[PDB]
Design a protein around this ligand. Structure first.
Ligand SMILES: Nc1ncnc2c1ncn2[C@@H]1O[C@H](COP(=O)(O)OP(=O)(O)O)[C@@H](O)[C@H]1O
Ligand SMILES: [Mg+2]
Lengths: 107, 88, 95, 93, 495
């Protein structure tokens, strides 16, 4: 019969066969269920969509039509939840968030 | 009388005073004392010592002689400063 | 000409906008080779490895300088000093 | 050669969310690394979670629990809701 | 396009069209499928001055190549007056053909002003507008002159053309010339890459050493002048039957003798009595020293001891370079330095044997650090010396060369490096040089010994070459030799 992928019949875009393959041959457990790849693909897709939307917002805020590591840095550090999740990472070529202490400004 | 290599400069002093000041400004400071330069050089040297030690350990385990960027990423993540962009 | 501090705020604005590298490339690369000499003789280094090392070092030093600046401001000052940087490192479980 | 990427899937999600933008190569590599890192975090937490309960099977229950343990605040809630939606749609279809 | 493209084909077939390999294999096949069915002998003075007899036919060769509309490389030897023979051709276009400008004078930074000096002395009333200087004086010079479309001769250095490309990219050109063209030998070199996009009718390349490293480099020169004709190295390198050595009976080489006949013009310094004196050589073999014998064995069997092959060349030169081989502190400059150097032991005696003869030795050494050992050894022997090595500015260089090239001068040993800048430096007031260390490229040492052998040299000049025994140097010299000998079998039998 004609074959349709688990990604399609699950509604997602991220791959489910690849996730299942990694979970199996990743020495995570002896035997792997049949809904875990779907759940993991859904979660990864959600996180990717969230950060990408914030990055696109920043990119258009700077009048540009291509997301760059600077915009990734800016979105991640301006959203507090993603900032906590990615608190310990350092996006390469991301620069720093603009900030000058109030005391340092002139009178 | 200069067959020997009497002329040479130290490597840690290659981290110039204005480079320290550029880092300081991006951090967001407004006035820098005179000893920040030496202290910063010391701190940077210690950090590099640790990271490079772990990276070299990885490379010599793998039976190689080149320290790869992915090995450096492994060492850095082990230290606990995961780095995004250089693969992995 | 300019009152003191004006150029300082100007440079802070300059350098918090940019994303470039701040330490020169070849001096840092030479330092990396020299400091890696002792652990094991005859190590090669590829450019991506050295670049990752420089990225990590710059990020570390920038965060350290933010912590030092906050320490200095806490003590009713605006100049940073080795006292400030030592306190900042030792309170982060490094010293 | 033949190195797996996630790049095409990231681009698909991008063209879904903002269908007029693009991604530079460095940004794409950063995003791929982010996906791999979060994947390995979730998988490791699920592995430890199954090992703690004398259980020898990764399944959706501890995938969900690992998601709830790692993602903070509203992220956990939204991700859990979306995961359950996807898995129920998959089993139904 | 095709009118010239076709016309060049049978013209190649016209004058000794013995190619018969790539003229037909080459998408020009269908273009030639249509045709498949089938003078200034007076030393002319339109440019001012008289031209010595053997220089004219080169110009007419350029004229004939222009009259046939094909690019060509001349291969006049150093000091033969390529400068005059170049500008004369441009005068031909300005006077006989009445086509003045535009043209480039792409040249090394050292000779930027030199050609303009020679340009006016045989052809005044010329539009020479050299583009050189800081970021500013160059910049406004672009609009008034380069963007003014009011020039005929444009002088700009290798570094300049890679900087001011955008102006010169826009400007159409007739001819483009590059002096000492061998820098175009890596076809992926960024300067060679840029010149691909320069619009011109034909190009002129000036050289004396076309073949230095391989025969692959020649095609890169050929890929520049006539990209359509050659357009490939597989038909040039491999088709030539592995440098025509293991599968030749002196026949395919005979083919290439006439294949690249109408493209090069190499005239010998033998046919003119300028130096009027043949050169001499020794290949003296140095018994390797004792402490070196320790190190060479130590390096082999397994401090930065990487790139083994050159490391062994350090041991073959002087063990004192290894940081520790010499006796420890305190440091003295005495005969103990001479013992631990197999070459210097031999070199020391010969340095004495020429002192009484009034000779002045011109040491050419690799690894400028090696000079420092010789410098202090020179200091030990109380010898008159001056140094001109890398990292010494030209004003320091010229005063240094004056000390050597002074009337009733007294300097005995004058240190250099195997490269030592451009050909321009004049060392004809000397009689002996020493190639203390050999080089991979024999041409890289060919012109270095031509530093002494240049024009005006009356007395015989003696050239040495120290060779370590049963070591790495043994294989390098034959590697240079066969690469050197490759030149004769390829070039040194046309003219
Ligand atoms: N017919 C001639 N009469 C007088 N002098 C000449 C003649 N031809 C060449 N010369 C001189 O010989 C010198 C040779 O220089 P040349 O080898 O062309 O320099 P480069 O090697 O930089 O091209 C020139 O400076 C020129 O002045
Ligand atoms: Mg010349």
């Amino acid at each position: 019969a004609k074959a349709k992928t688990r990604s399609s019949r699950a509604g997602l875009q991220f791959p489910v066969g690849r996730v299942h393959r990694l979970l199996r041959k990743g020495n995570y457990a002896e035997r792997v269920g049949a809904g875990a790849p779907v759940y993991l693909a859904a979660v990864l897709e959600y996180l990717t969509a969230e950060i990408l939307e914030l990055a696109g917002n920043a990119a258009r805020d700077n009048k540009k039509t291509r997301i760059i590591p600077r915009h990734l840095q800016l979105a991640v550090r301006n959203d507090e939840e993603l900032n906590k999740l990615l608190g310990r990472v350092t996006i390469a070529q991301g620069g720093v968030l603009p900030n000058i202490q109030s005391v340092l400004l002139p009178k | 009388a200069k067959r020997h290599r009497k002329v040479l400069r130290d490597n840690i002093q290659g981290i110039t005073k204005p480079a320290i000041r550029r880092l300081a400004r991006r951090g967001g400071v407004k006035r820098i004392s005179g000893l920040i330069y030496e202290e910063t050089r010391g701190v940077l040297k210690v950090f590099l010592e640790n990271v490079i030690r772990d990276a070299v350990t990885y490379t010599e385990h793998a039976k190689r002689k080149t320290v790869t960027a992915m090995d450096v990423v492994y060492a850095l993540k082990r230290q606990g400063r995961t780095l995004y962009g250089f693969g992995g | 000409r300019y009152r003191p501090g004006t150029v300082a705020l100007r440079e802070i604005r300059r350098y918090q906008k940019s994303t470039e590298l701040l330490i020169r490339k070849l001096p840092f690369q030479r330092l990396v080779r020299e400091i890696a000499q002792d652990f094991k003789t005859d190590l090669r280094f590829q450019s991506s490895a050295v670049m990752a090392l420089q990225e990590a070092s710059e990020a570390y030093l920038v965060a350290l300088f933010e912590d030092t600046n906050l320490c200095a401001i806490h003590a009713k000052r605006v100049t940073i000093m080795p006292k400030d940087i030592q306190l900042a490192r030792r309170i982060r479980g490094e010293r | 050669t033949r190195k797996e990427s996630y790049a095409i899937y990231v681009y698909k999600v991008l063209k879904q969310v903002h269908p007029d933008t693009g991604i530079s190569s460095k940004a794409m590599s950063i995003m791929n690394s982010f996906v791999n890192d979060v994947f390995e975090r979730i998988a490791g937490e699920a592995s430890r979670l199954a090992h703690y309960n004398k259980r020898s099977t990764i399944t959706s229950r501890e995938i969900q629990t690992a998601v709830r343990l790692l993602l903070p605040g509203e992220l956990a809630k939204h991700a859990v809701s979306e995961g359950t939606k996807a898995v129920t749609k998959y089993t139904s279809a | 396009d095709l009118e010239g493209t076709t016309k060049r084909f049978e013209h190649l077939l016209s004058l000794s069209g013995l190619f018969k390999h790539f003229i037909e294999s080459k998408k020009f096949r269908q273009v030639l499928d249509v045709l498949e069915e089938n003078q200034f002998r007076e030393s002319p003075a339109y440019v001012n001055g008289q031209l010595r007899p053997y220089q004219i036919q080169g110009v007419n060769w350029l004229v004939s190549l222009h009259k046939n509309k094909i690019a060509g490389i001349l291969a006049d030897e150093m000091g033969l007056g390529k400068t005059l023979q170049t500008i004369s051709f441009l005068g031909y276009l300005r006077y006989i053909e009445k086509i003045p400008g535009p043209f480039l004078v792409i040249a090394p930074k050292s000779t930027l002003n030199n050609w303009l000096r020679e340009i006016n002395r045989w052809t005044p009333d010329v539009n020479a507008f050299i583009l050189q200087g800081d970021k500013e004086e160059r910049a406004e010079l672009i609009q008034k002159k380069l963007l003014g479309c009011d020039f005929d001769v444009v002088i700009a250095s290798y570094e300049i053309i890679i900087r001011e490309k955008s102006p010169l990219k826009k400007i159409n050109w007739e001819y483009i010339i590059i002096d000492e063209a061998h820098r175009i030998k890596n076809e992926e070199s960024m300067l060679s890459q840029v010149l691909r996009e320069f619009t011109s009718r034909n190009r002129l390349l000036i050289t004396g050493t076309p073949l230095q490293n391989n025969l692959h480099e020649l095609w890169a020169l050929l890929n520049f002048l006539l990209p359509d004709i050659f357009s490939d190295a597989q038909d040039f390198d491999d088709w030539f039957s592995s440098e025509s050595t293991e599968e030749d009976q002196d026949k395919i080489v005979k083919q290439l003798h006439t294949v690249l006949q109408p493209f090069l013009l190499r005239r010998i310094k033998s046919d003119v009595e300028t130096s009027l004196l043949p050169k001499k050589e020794l290949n003296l073999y140095v018994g390797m020293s004792s402490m070196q014998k320790k190190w060479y064995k130590k390096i082999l069997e397994k401090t930065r001891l990487l790139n083994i092959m050159m490391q062994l060349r350090k041991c073959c030169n002087h063990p004192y370079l290894f940081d520790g081989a010499e006796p420890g502190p305190p440091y003295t400059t005495d005969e103990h330095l001479v013992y631990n150097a197999a070459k210097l032991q031999v070199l020391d005696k010969l340095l004495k044997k020429l002192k009484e003869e009034g000779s002045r030795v011109l040491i050419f050494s690799q690894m400028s650090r090696l000079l420092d050992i010789l410098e202090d050894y020179c200091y030990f022997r109380n010898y008159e010396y001056c140094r001109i090595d890398g990292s010494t500015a030209h004003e320091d260089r010229i005063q240094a060369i004056d000390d050597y090239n002074a009337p009733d001068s007294k300097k005995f040993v004058f240190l250099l490096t195997t490269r030592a800048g451009g050909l321009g430096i004049n060392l004809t007031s000397a009689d002996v040089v020493v190639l203390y260390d050999s080089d991979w490229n024999p041409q890289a040492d060919l012109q270095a010994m031509d530093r002494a052998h240049r024009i005006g040299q009356k007395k015989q000049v003696k050239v040495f070459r120290l060779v370590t025994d049963n070591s790495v140097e043994e294989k390098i010299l034959e590697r240079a030799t066969q690469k050197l000998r490759l030149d004769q079998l390829v070039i040194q039998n046309r003219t």
